[PDB]
Amino acid sequence: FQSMAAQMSEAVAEKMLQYRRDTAGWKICREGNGVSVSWRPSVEFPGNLYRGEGIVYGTLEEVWDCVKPGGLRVKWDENVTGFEIIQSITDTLCVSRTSTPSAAMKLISPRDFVDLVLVKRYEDGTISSNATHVEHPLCPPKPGFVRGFNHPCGCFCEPLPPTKTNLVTFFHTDLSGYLPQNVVDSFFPRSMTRFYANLQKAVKQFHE
């Protein structure tokens, strides 16, 4: 069990690592203050993979405390209402349920996601989160939520040589249910720029 729970999650981080390095495919959506988001076709499902990049003005373990899988995310992230750690497998590997609220003028009704999420730490100091969908018998479709499926996604928290942190995040989400494309195509870009906007505010609160 261990050897494969660990295994398919290791595959996830491997893909995430490749998403971080790749410079190809990526077509820019928008930019502006602090952030930059681009996208490309996912190979995991019909839809897209989204890439956020942005310097967060906080210590590396403050920014991580915010996005770490419960901790903090329920608070500051407008797109999260419920975070539950279901089956805590390893020190560093666990199965989580995430509840999103309504979005895009109630066109996107609440979804929930059941992820295998692995925290893995790199040699440079980078701490990362690596999440993929998994079916779990103790967390089936809930009444009034659509079951969404995240494909390999999460956060890279990268220390900078000074007192700041680089945050690169990938949203790889299948909203699923029954949604027109253009709805979905508008939401995600905006969802990422708002994510960073929020994350920043949360950080600032420790420096105040």
Residue numbers in the entry: 2 to 70, 73 to 164, 167 to 213
What do the authors of the reporting publication say about this deposited model?
Steroidogenic acute regulatory (StAR) protein related lipid transfer (START) domains are small globular modules that form a cavity where lipids and lipid hormones bind. The ∼210 residue globular START module is a curved β-sheet gripped by two α-helices. The concave face of the β-sheet and the C-terminal α-helix enclose a hydrophobic cavity that can accommodate lipid molecules. Here we present crystal structures of four human START domains, those of STARD1, STARD5, STARD13 and STARD14/ACOT11.
